[PDB]
Amino acid sequence: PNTIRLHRVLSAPPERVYRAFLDPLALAKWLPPEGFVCKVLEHDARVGGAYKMEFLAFASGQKHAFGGRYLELVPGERIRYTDRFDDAGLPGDMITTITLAPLSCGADLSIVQEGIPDAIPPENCYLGWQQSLKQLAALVEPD
Amino acid sequence: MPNTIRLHRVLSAPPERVYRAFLDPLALAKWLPPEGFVCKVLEHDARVGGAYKMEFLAFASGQKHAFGGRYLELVPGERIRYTDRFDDAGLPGDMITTITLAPLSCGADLSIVQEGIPDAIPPENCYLGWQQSLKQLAALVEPD
Amino acid sequence: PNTIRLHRVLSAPPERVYRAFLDPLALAKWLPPEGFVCKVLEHDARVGGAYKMEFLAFASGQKHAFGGRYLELVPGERIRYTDRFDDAGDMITTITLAPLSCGADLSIVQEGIPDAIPPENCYLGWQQSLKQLAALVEPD
Amino acid sequence: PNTIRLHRVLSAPPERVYRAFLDPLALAKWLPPEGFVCKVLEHDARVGGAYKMEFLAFASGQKHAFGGRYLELVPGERIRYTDRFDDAGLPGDMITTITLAPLSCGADLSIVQEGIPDAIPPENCYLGWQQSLKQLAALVEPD
């Protein structure tokens, strides 16, 4: 497996970025990469709560579902959750942890995903996150 | 002005795909709300005479704005017309927007006209909003 | 089928948008669409004055030179200039600006576009350029 | 001083990306962040060669000149140059090294900038680079 990490400085308070990661309405807009829509099936934001949604390629209809559970939640500071692909051919336990800290300009965002299957090329995960992070910024930075 | 807005864009996507983006609740929730806003679809009956309702929420403040109406006409990959009115009493006025699509070698031609914008809503504000929504629409409909 | 029309509302005062259309440092940054760079050869911004630029596809390096002359220059209100490619028709584009509470109203009309170049491709090119224009002029 | 580090995966070959860091017509387009234009004064792309340019805020016209020397240049793989802004209280210079590696999707880019005066908040540098990098991608990824 492989571990990946990203870092972004955002012009928004950490609490607002934090909410963006848990709010189903926010997630459906910023999480899916370009050309993908997202349907959120379950969003129980509690330690132990279940995560559930699926991405759909808009031009083909190709759907990919995934989900997991929230392992830890520290308001405006930390989110760690598991990810399990319901796709036929990707078993295992992928864990991502989001760390947020305040800055004068807003917030420092750290993301790390461990246990990424060797089948999934790391480069693809970075491309995917880069698109989603750009979308997250457009949503959280205003006002 | 007055109370009217007209938008034209060339999209690198088939007319049918763009058409689909204007009626699919999952697409709409992603591209329709402008920057800093999220969308929640309350009702979505995609057929002539059918009603629909949605609400926009400013993500930073939580401030909500709900609007709704009925579809007047639906021709696959060609046109869509619907009534659009706000629940806010401070924004009285029924809006009529008509979307027209046509094929092109690169993809599709899109024209949008919004009539009846409430007097309390500066038309320039609608242009700023649609310009953001249109950019998001392109990002969704143009790939692959 | 040789005339194109674009309209945009910008969050910047008219005077600043006007300057973006004439400042060579601004033009080199926003005019060339995605994947293109621009070199400004001439920029005599006076009525009767000439401007000359070249767009280069960054990946391939294919060059495209074009130029013309300014016919109208009213600070924050109007710019009109001719435009011709160094490849064998003359075009005239007119930019009109008006103040708005939120900033500026921008109208563009480009006439005489050679039938050789599909209008749809001009719209696509302008859409990319206008997005780049907004990013430069709306700040601060 | 402080050190900044950034990482991006780009859908373009390393040589084209490399080229974007040395071509004056490219730098003038992607290097200056939002609301800024770039004027290139001198651009001698070779070891020991001089580097000189200035960013101008388009709205105010406020100028910011900076320059340096190219210390290392390896086609499609590495670039190392010094950088210093023309400001009092800032006698020392910074060193930034760009490293590229191929990927099937295109290229992996790593940037490291050290020697940033403690007076300059690192977060501001990140925001600046994030904007420059998005412009870089739009330029180099096409075709």
UniProtKB/TrEMBL annotation, chains A, D:
<dbReference type="InterPro" id="IPR023393">
    <property type="entry name" value="START-like_dom_sf"/>
</dbReference>
<dbReference type="Pfam" id="PF08327">
    <property type="entry name" value="AHSA1"/>
</dbReference>
<comment type="similarity">
    <text>Belongs to the AHA1 family.</text>
</comment>
<dbReference type="InterPro" id="IPR013538">
    <property type="entry name" value="ASHA1/2-like_C"/>
</dbReference>
<protein>
    <recommendedName>
        <fullName>Activator of Hsp90 ATPase homologue 1/2-like C-terminal domain-containing protein</fullName>
    </recommendedName>
</protein>
<feature type="domain" description="Activator of Hsp90 ATPase homologue 1/2-like C-terminal">
    <location>
        <begin position="12"/>
        <end position="141"/>
    </location>
</feature>
